[PDB]
Amino acid sequence: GAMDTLYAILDEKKSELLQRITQEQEEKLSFIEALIQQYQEQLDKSTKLVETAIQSLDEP
Amino acid sequence: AMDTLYAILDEKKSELLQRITQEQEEKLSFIEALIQQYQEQLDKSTKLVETAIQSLD
């Protein structure tokens, strides 16, 4: 009947919505991971610069 | 009747869509837990760095 069709459609819509939300969340996750990596690298570079400058100051 | 036949078919289609929806929910649940964990790690890190910054003042 028409009511069975309607519910099947709503279930399909539910799966499609989950799919859309998932893709957007996956994008969110990737951006977060690329952000953490860049931050980490910035923090690492700066600290290595600093520890090298001090180590070399008290020397050469 | 095409009714009883189409009914059994619809049951199996429905089961398959349920299986797919279940898997989708699992995967989305995992992505979201990961996003929260990374955000918390990022938060802790910025706090540690701000402590570092202030300790140089």
Next chain:
Amino acid sequence: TLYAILDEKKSELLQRITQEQEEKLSFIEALIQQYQEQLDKSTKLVETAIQSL
């Protein structure tokens, strides 16, 4: 009077070592300030970026 001579030299030596160490302190202070500024910039950037999500 000989110790006056030796104390003049010591004073001149103290003066040069002092300028060298002042320079050292100057470099350290600037290095530290530079570190702080970079740490801070990186941190503000990441938080801003997070906020834009």
Next chain:
Amino acid sequence: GAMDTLYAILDEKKSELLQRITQEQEEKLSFIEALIQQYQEQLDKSTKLVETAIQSLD
């Protein structure tokens, strides 16, 4: 020799002035060294903190 004496007194005086100047130089220099050492220690504590932040992001 009135002029000799004046020089002698002045001779004593410069030595005394010198000893005060030297003592002050050492006090300034020692202070500068403490300040350097203090800063180097803060910077070390600071870098380990950033290292812990970096390790957190793993």
